[PDB]
Structure formats: structure tokens, C-alpha cells
């Protein structure tokens, strides 16, 4: 057993986290009351990972749902699968952090950390072997960027040897007015360099984009948006869940998906929004993307594609192989091999073939230079510090989180440029 | 007496053990609840098979095996397999989480918490031998626990167990079925530490058992268990001198006198003949001529390299089913005349042949031709050390950067035992030139 | 030719016990300079994370100023 320790904070991270267990729960044959109603015995054979078993053959996920908010909690009970959390797992408060990620990291949020590290105890305490964490949370709000930074960084303490992946959804003004999202998001993405091992960059800006132009939805709701989030969290999490030649787990990921430390922030992929070059093509467009970043601007490090359904092995290694021939210029040559195919026979609902990408290319510097010109623009003007500075912030650190990101982008463009020869 | 313990380390090790071990029972007539009628006598024995197995009292012929792997999924199917019978669970040693690729948890982090039981377990074995010859180690370069732990497994074994003998079989990562970017990092750490330690080791070239498998069984995407039934027969045809017995049967060790002019050239090719659909093999019958001449085609090697451009230390031709020497002399004869087969000038040009009459044995449902002949060369060629350019090209590709060097370190490595292993490695690759320099 | 047989047998036995030896001591100082290693990678790490618990406790001293 290699369990997996799910934790959802904020609006935005309770959202996806809900859709994530209802779309996997389905995958697995598990109902809204935690029976299996199953086909495949592959459905259980990784069921640890995101699930414990409770005497009576009931599975419950392996979840902690937390909020400054108290609304959330209701709104998490009446929704679908509302019925399969533990009702111990809800660490909720009264405040409501409004945007403030001073409020979720140093006050507010810290009165209720505690609270929430008592209900990952529990949780990792029980586990046979804890891989590590997966947090789910937005960074242009307070409470899952404040709070949910605090929390990473608290448990890293006391779980220093396991391994940290968040999913975390950037800020984009075609999604959301609020204005101070680009502080929130750099205090953040300073967190996240150092203190986690895997960083899922959703962004915002890119799912707008996909509704918008590929689907030809005008506006797009928060339903379409995490319809692809929900997607891809299901694809790149399948090789976690499903017994594959590959035997996936967050460390291994991590091994092979981040050769220098503060380089682990991902640009995930999905296709379809069909035959295998039809799929391969797709899945190395830009338009498919889930960070709002052109690959051909960069250079991949690494990459990490999982194929799901009935296909046919050597059809999707020919194509691999030729996408790799075909776009030479755009991978990396002093790192052999770092393109990686698995398959899966078990497709997601609606589909009979998708394809999931999971790579490290150097062109998400265009999503941190996005959020790095939101920010300078307000913090030149100093607007709205004090919010920040009333709970005690001091307005250096400000400084920091944009030196540390700018940092961030000139070390993707080094090995954006770095030759073998 | 002269037994032989086979240790098979990680996924790779374990899986290539299951074929082998299922191999060895059907060619001695083994059952998979470890009964062999055609054994009388119960409890014991000297014969030739007793090298690989022990009797109990109760009939039942147990492998002179362990199994180790640091996480427990492979090693559970051995447990609730077809030939779960075989094994006591002692032989059998898992842990709960791998190496995770990475050799420095494999040797330092998550080995070093279960060296000392598996040590303990293989002084078991030891202790039921009463003239222990050495060790079979089974293993990958490229998995975190198969280079990691192997290497801190046969450091352990040199203290204790002297200068007793240890083998390798070791598997070379090819990209078609890799793991992990960082197989060439963990294949030269490995290579480095063991080198000292291993007295031969017979290399496995993934992707040259993948382009078999491709071209000559007709398998159009080989998996694990299409290359470790092709692995399992090359192994077999190693050991079967271990195992049987005859009159024209020459020992693995005494091919080893001849393979290994100096220690650290302790790499043999092993080139095998012939693997046939049996669609192809209906009504076509290979001669001795035909599978010797096909141990000199490089497509048939278990390590791609073209020893045509390299030169000639050993040859050993390792026969087995109905084959009479009278007709590997004048096969040999042929293939000197006709092919380029050019030794150093400080070693004899002479062919070493070993003969074991009793046929090569198919595992049911697998793609081999059951053949009334079959043939394993081992010589050492300096062709060989293309591999170790390949796999330190890679190294140095990814080191020049230090990419992915820091998960090593966070587990208590240090940079100097990178380079230190790949200065090694660079003396393996000049040693490899030297003796192929004519005398002065 | 007595003792000179003795000194081969001699040589024989005191070079697989050096080798013992000294594979025995350079595994001893590999697993220990390792664990080392390790163990301050690990404490440099909590170092760091308690420099945060420094600094929040900081921030709320500075806004307990209101
Ligand atoms: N994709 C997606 N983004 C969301 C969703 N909900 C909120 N967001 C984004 O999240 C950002 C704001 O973060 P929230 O999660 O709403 O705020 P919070 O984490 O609950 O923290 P507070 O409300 O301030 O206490 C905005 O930029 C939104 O665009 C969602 O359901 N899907
Ligand atoms: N021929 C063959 N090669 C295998 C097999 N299993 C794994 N490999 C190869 O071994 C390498 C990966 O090493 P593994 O043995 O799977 O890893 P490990 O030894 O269990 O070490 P961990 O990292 O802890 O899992 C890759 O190059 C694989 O291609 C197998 O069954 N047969
Ligand atoms: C292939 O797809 C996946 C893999 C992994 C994974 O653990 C792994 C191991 N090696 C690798 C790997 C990555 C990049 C280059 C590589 N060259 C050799 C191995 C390798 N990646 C995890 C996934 O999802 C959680 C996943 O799905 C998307
Ligand atoms: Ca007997
Ligand atoms: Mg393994």
C-alpha cells in the first residue's frame, strides 16, 4: 500500500477536489455510499492510493476539506459524493480570508492550521506506506494560496521525506475581476518553489481559452472550466491508480520529471477537447494545453504522456518516436530518453481514446512573466498593501516573492539555452 | 557438491527468476509442488540438478534461491503464483516502499534497513551447502533497488564469503522498455561499486532482446514476459552445465578460465542460436552448421556491438540437444574461412565447446520453436565496451549539467562518487583498448 | 622449496583477508559519511522551515501593534 493524502483548500480547491473524487470514484466503481460496483478487478487493485477501506467493504477517500469559509462545507455535503467524506475530514472556520493571502498564510489561516494538521495525522498515521500529499487549490484568492501555502509548508515539517504535489489553479482577469490576485498568486509561486516537489500549473487563462475558442463556449462557466480540470486530473493521476508496467508513484514522477529542484512546476495536456496521430498531434498542440504557454517558444526538459484506452502499443510508440524526430528542436539534447509513453486499457468516461501530457518545457516562464507584469503594475503603484501590511506583513517580502519568481524565469531561460556540445 | 545461490534483486532480477526457475523445473521434470518422480532419492542427493536444488525430507525440490525487492508487488506474485510451492517464504524478502530509481536509496536510505535479513536468509541457504561454489545474481542496471542494492549486496557478500565466486546477470536499459531518465546514472554507480566485487558478469541488452523478439518471434510490441522467456533460455544454456551432466559437458568455470584474461575483463557476449517461430521451424530443421554460423551474426547477440570491429580474447560455443562434435569441428572449420573473426596476438585462436545432450526445453504458450539443437557463444570481445561508450555518453550528457544529481544528493550522495564512477568507467573503456593493441 | 611453499599459501591467505578488510572499511565509511550527509540535508531543510515559524510569529507581533 503506497496511500496518497488528499487535501482540498478554498473555494477553488474544494471545487475541483469534489469533481476529481466524483470523476475517479466513477473510474473505480465506487457509489456515492462507498461500494464498489465493479467490472475489472484493476478498478481495486490500487484502490489504497486514494482510498481507505472501512469494515463493511466501503471505501472512503483519503481526504481533508478545508475552508475559512463555512459555506463550502454545506455546499461540498450537497453535492454529489457529498456522502462519502468523512465527516471528520471537514476543517472549516467562520472568517472567510476575502482575497487576502496575508489573512489565510499568517493570521486567520494560521489560528486553523492546527485544526486541519490534526486531521492529516489521523490520515497519515493510518497509512501502510504515505506516498506524500496532493493539494488542490487556487492561488488568486487567500485562503487556499495563504492558507494552503501555510499548510504545505507545515507539513513538510513534520513529513519532510515524502514527496508534495499540488494542483494549482493561476489567476486570470478572463475568469476573475478581483484585483489583487497577482500578489496573491506571486506570495504563492514564492512558497511553492521552495517547498513543494510537483506543481500542476492549471491556469486559468488557458482553460478560458479552451472553452472559449476550441469549444466555442461563450461564457464559460466554473462547470466548463473544471470539466477540463477534471480531465486532466484524472489523466495524470491514472498511472497513481491503475496497476501499468510503469508502477507510477509521486516520487517516481518526481525523479524523472524535475532534474533541477526548483523546476517542478508542469504544463498539463488532454486531447481530445479519432486515431493515434491524431492524438499525438493534438496533445503537443498548444491549443491543448493547460497552462496558457506555447511549447515552441521553449525547450522540454521532460515529458510525461499516458494513453488510455484500446489501441494499438506499437501505433502510439511509432508516433511518439516521430513527434520526438519531427520536433527534435523543441526537446532538450543533454537529457536522453526524457520522453515517456504509458498506456492504459481502462479509457475515462465518454471516450474510447485520450491522451494525457504531462511536460516540463521551459515556455512556462510565459505564464510567470504573465502574472509577473499583473504584479509590478500594482505594486509600483503600492496599491492595496495595506491589506497586506495591516496583518503585520512586511512589504519587502513583497520584494522577495518577485525576485524569487523573476529568479524562477531566468532559470527556466538558462536551460532554455544550454547546449550539449 | 558444488552449489550454486541465485539472488535475484529488483523487478528485473525477480521476473527473469520466475522464467528461470520455471524453465529449470520442466527441463528436470520438476512439478510446481516441487515433486520429481523420477528422483528416488528422497530427502538428498548429489546429482547434477542438486547444484540448484535442495530435497526436503518430505520429496520436495527447493530452489537454492532468494528473492529481494524493496517493495512488495513483484515478489506477491511469486507468493499466489503458479510455483508459490517452490519456495519457502523465507526465500522470499520484501519491503514496503522501492527505490524509487534512484540508487542512493537502493544502496543507502532504503537498503541499508534490510541488508542484514537478507544476508541472514542467504547464510541459510549457505549453511544447507556443503560445498558452496559461489553466487548467480540477477539484477538491472537501471532500477534503484537493481543497481542500489545489488551493489551494496555484493560488497556485503566479499566480506562474507571471501573471494567465493559471484556472477552477474545483469540487464543494460534500452529506451523501449526504460523506467526512468536516470538509468544511466544508477548503470555507471552500479557498474563502478560492483566491478571489484563480481568475478563475471554476463550482460543482457534490452533492446537487443526487443529486436529479437521484433524480428525473428514475430512480436510486434515485446512486453517483459516475451523478453524474459528469450533471457531465460540464455541463462538456462549457461547454466546447464551447472545442472547436467555428461561426457562431453565442459564446467562454466572452466569457460571462465578461458573468458577472463584479467579481472576487471570479466564481460562476456553471449550470442544464442536459434530463436525460430515455430511456423518457420515446421519442416525446417537448423543443422549444427546453421546455428553456429548464426552465433556470428550480430542480430542474434545479447548486447548489441559489432565484434567485427573489435578483436578476439575467448570463444566458447555452448551446445545443447543433438549435436556430436564431429560436426562443430567442420562447422568451426567453415566459419573461420568465411568470417571476420580476428583475436589479440597474445591469445590462442582455439574454439572451447561444450556439449549437453538433452534438448532445449519450451515453456508452454511462449513463441519459441521447440529445436532438436541449440547453441549459446560466450567470447570476450572488445566489441563489448560499446556498450559502456553508449551508457557513458548518456552519463555525461545529463552530469554536464548535474540534471537530476540533486535527488542523489538529498539522499546523502556526494558529486565526487559521480565522477569518481565515471573515472572508473573511463579506465574500463581504455582497458578495453589496451588489450586489443598488438604486442611490442 | 618447504618455505617457500609455506610463504605462497601465507601471501594467499593475508590478500583475501586484506581485501576483506578494506572492502569491509570502505563500506563502513561509505554508509557512515552518507548517513551524514543525509541527516543534514534533512536538518538543514527543518532549519529552514523553522525560519518561517520565526518570521510568522513576527508578522503577528507586528499587526498585534494595531
Ligand atoms: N478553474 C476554477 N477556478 C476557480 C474556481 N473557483 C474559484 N476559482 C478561481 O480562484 C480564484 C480565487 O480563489 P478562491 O478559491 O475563490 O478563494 P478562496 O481560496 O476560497 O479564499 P477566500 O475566498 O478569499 O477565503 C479566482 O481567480 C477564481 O477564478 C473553480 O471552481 N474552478
Ligand atoms: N528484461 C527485463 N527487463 C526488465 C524487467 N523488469 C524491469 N526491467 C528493466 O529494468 C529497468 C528498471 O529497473 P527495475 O528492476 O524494474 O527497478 P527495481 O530493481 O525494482 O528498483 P526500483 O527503482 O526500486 O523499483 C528498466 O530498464 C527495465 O526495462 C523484466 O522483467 N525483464
Ligand atoms: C509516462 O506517464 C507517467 C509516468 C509517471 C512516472 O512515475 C514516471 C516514471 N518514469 C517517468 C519518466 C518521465 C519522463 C521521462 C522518462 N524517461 C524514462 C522514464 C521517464 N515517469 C507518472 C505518471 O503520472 C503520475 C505518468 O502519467 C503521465
Ligand atoms: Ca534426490
Ligand atoms: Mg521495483
Redesign the interface.
Known amino acids: 500500500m503506497r496511500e496518497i493524502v488528499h487535501i482540498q483548500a478554498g473555494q477553488c480547491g474544494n471545487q475541483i477536489g469534489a469533481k476529481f473524487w466524483e470523476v475517479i470514484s466513477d473510474e473505480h466503481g465506487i457509489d456515492p455510499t462507498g461500494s464498489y460496483h465493479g467490472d475489472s478487478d484493476l478498478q481495486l487493485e490500487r484502490i489504497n492510493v486514494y482510498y481507505n477501506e472501512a469494515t463493511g467493504n466501503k471505501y472512503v477517500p483519503r481526504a481533508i476539506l478545508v475552508d475559512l469559509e463555512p459555506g463550502t462545507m454545506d455546499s461540498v455535503r450537497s453535492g454529489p459524493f457529498g456522502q462519502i467524506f468523512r465527516p471528520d475530514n471537514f476543517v472549516f472556520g467562520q472568517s472567510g480570508a476575502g482575497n487576502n493571502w496575508a489573512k489565510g498564510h499568517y493570521t486567520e489561516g494560521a489560528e486553523l492550521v492546527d485544526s486541519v494538521l490534526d486531521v492529516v495525522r489521523k490520515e497519515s498515521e493510518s497509512c501502510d506506506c504515505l506516498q506524500g500529499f496532493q493539494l488542490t487549490h487556487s492561488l488568486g484568492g487567500g485562503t487556499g494560496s495563504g492558507m494552503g501555502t501555510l499548510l504545505i509548508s507545515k507539513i513538510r515539517e513534520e513529513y519532510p521525506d515524502r514527496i508534495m504535489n499540488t494542483f494549482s489553479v493561476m489567476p486570470s482577469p478572463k475568469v476573475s475581476d478581483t484585483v489583487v490576485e497577482p500578489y496573491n498568486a506571486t506570495l504563492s509561486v514564492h512558497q511553492l518553489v521552495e517547498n513543494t516537489d510537483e506543481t500542476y500549473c492549471i491556469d486559468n487563462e488557458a482553460l478560458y481559452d479552451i472553452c472559449f475558442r476550441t469549444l466555442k463556449l461563450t461564457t464559460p462557466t466554473y462547470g466548463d472550466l473544471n470539466h477540463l480540470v477534471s480531465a486532466t486530473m484524472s489523466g495524470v493521476t491514472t498511472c497513481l491508480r491503475f496497476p501499468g508496467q510503469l508502477n507510477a508513484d509521486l516520487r517516481k514522477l518526481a525523479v524523472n520529471m524535475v532534474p533541477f529542484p526548483r523546476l517542478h512546476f508542469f504544463m498539463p495536456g488532454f486531447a481530445p477537447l479519432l486515431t493515434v496521430p491524431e492524438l499525438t498531434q493534438q496533445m503537443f498542440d498548444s491549443k491543448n494545453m493547460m497552462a496558457a504557454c506555447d511549447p515552441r517558444h521553449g525547450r522540454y526538459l521532460t515529458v510525461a504522456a499516458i494513453f488510455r484506452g484500446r489501441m494499438s502499443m506499437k501505433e502510439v510508440d511509432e508516433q511518439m518516436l516521430n513527434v520526438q524526430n519531427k520536433n527534435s528542436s523543441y526537446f532538450v539534447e543533454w537529457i536522453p530518453n526524457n520522453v515517456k509513453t504509458a498506456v492504459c486499457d481502462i479509457p475515462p468516461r465518454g471516450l474510447k481514446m485520450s491522451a494525457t501530457f504531462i511536460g516540463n518545457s521551459t515556455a512556462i516562464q510565459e505564464l510567470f512573466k504573465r502574472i509577473s507584469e499583473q504584479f509590478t503594475a500594482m505594486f509600483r503603484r503600492k496599491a492595496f498593501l495595506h491589506w497586506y501590511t495591516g496583518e503585520g506583513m512586511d512589504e519587502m517580502e513583497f520584494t522577495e516573492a518577485e525576485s524569487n519568481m523573476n529568479d524562477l524565469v531566468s532559470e527556466y531561460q538558462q536551460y532554455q539555452d544550454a547546449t550539449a556540445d | 557438491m558444488r552449489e550454486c545461490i541465485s539472488i535475484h534483486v529488483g523487478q528485473a532480477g525477480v521476473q527473469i527468476g520466475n522464467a528461470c526457475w520455471e524453465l529449470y523445473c520442466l527441463e528436470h521434470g520438476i512439478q510446481p509442488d516441487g515433486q520429481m518422480p523420477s528422483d528416488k532419492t528422497i530427502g538428498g542427493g548429489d546429482d547434477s540438478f542438486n547444484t540448484f536444488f535442495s530435497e526436503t525430507g518430505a520429496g520436495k525440490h527447493v530452489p537454492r534461491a532468494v528473492f529481494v525487492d524493496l517493495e512488495p508487488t513483484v515478489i506477491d506474485e511469486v507468493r499466489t503464483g503458479t510455483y508459490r510451492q517452490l519456495f519457502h517464504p523465507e526465500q522470499l524478502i520484501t519491503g514496503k516502499e522501492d527505490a524509487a530509481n534512484n540508487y542512493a536509496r537502493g544502496h543507502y536510505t532504503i537498503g541499508k534497513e534490510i541488508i542484514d535479513l537478507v544476508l541472514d536468509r542467504i547464510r541459510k541457504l549457505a549453511d544447507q551447502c556443503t560445498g558452496l561454489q559461489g553466487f548467480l545474481v540477477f539484477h538491472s542496471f537501471g532500477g534503484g533497488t537493481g543497481s542500489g542494492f545489488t551493489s551494496l549486496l555484493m560488497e556485503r557478500l566479499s566480506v562474507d564469503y571471501g573471494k567465493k565466486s559471484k556472477l552477474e546477470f545483469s540487464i543494460y536499459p534500452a529506451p523501449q522498455v526504460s523506467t526512468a531518465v536516470v538509468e544511466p546514472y544508477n548503470s555507471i554507480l552500479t557498474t563502478h561499486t560492483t566491478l571489484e566485487h563480481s568475478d563475471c558478469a554476463f550482460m543482457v541488452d534490452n533492446e537487443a532482446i526487443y529486436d529479437i523478439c521484433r524480428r525473428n518471434l514475430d512480436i510486434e510490441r515485446p512486453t517483459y514476459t516475451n523478453l524474459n522467456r528469450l533471457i531465460s533460455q540464455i541463462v538456462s544454456s549457461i547454466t546447464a552445465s551447472l545442472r547436467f551432466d555428461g561426457a562431453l559437458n565442459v564446467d562454466l568455470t572452466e569457460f571462465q578460465t578461458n573468458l577472463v584474461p584479467y579481472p576487471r575483463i570479466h564481460f562476456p557476449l553471449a550470442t544464442y542460436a536459434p530463436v525460430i517461430s515455430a511456423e518457420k521451424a515446421y519442416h525446417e530443421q537448423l543443422s549444427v552448421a546453421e546455428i553456429t554460423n548464426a552465433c556470428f551474426e550480430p542480430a542474434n547477440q545479447m548486447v548489441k556491438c559489432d565484434p567485427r570491429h573489435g578483436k578476439y580474447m575467448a570463444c566458447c560455443l555452448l551446445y545443447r540437444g543433438d549435436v556430436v562434435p564431429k560436426d562443430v569441428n567442420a562447422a568451426i572449420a567453415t566459419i573461420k574461412t568465411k568470417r571476420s573473426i580476428q583475436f589479440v596476438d597474445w591469445c590462442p585462436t582455439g574454439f572451447k565447446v561444450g556439449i549437453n545432450y538433452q534438448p532445449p526445453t519450451v515453456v508452454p504458450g511462449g513463441d519459441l520453436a521447440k529445436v532438436q539443437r541449440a547453441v549459446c557463444m560466450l567470447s570476450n570481445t572488445t566489441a563489448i565496451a560499446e556498450a559502456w561508450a553508449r551508457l557513458d555518453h548518456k552519463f555525461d550528457l545529463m552530469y554536464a549539467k548535474r540534471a537530476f544529481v540533486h535527488w542523489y544528493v538529498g539522499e546523502g550522495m556526494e558529486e565526487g562518487e559521480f565522477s569518481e564512477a565515471r573515472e572508473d568507467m573511463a579506465a574500463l573503456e581504455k582497458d578495453y583498448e589496451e588489450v586489443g593493441v598488438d604486442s611490442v | 622449496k618447504r618455505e617457500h611453499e609455506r610463504e605462497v599459501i601465507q601471501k594467499a591467505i593475508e590478500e ?1 583477508n586484506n ?2 578488510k578494506m ?2 572499511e570502505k ?1 563502513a565509511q561509505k ?1 557512515e ?7 543534514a ?2 536538518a538543514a ?2 532549519e ?3 525560519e ?1 515559524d520565526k518570521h ?1 510569529e ?7 501593534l494595531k
Open positions: 583475501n581485501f576483506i572492502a569491509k563500506l554508509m559519511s552518507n548517513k551524514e550527509n543525509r541527516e540535508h534533512l531543510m527543518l529552514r522551515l523553522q518561517k510568522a513576527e508578522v503577528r507581533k507586528n499587526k498585534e
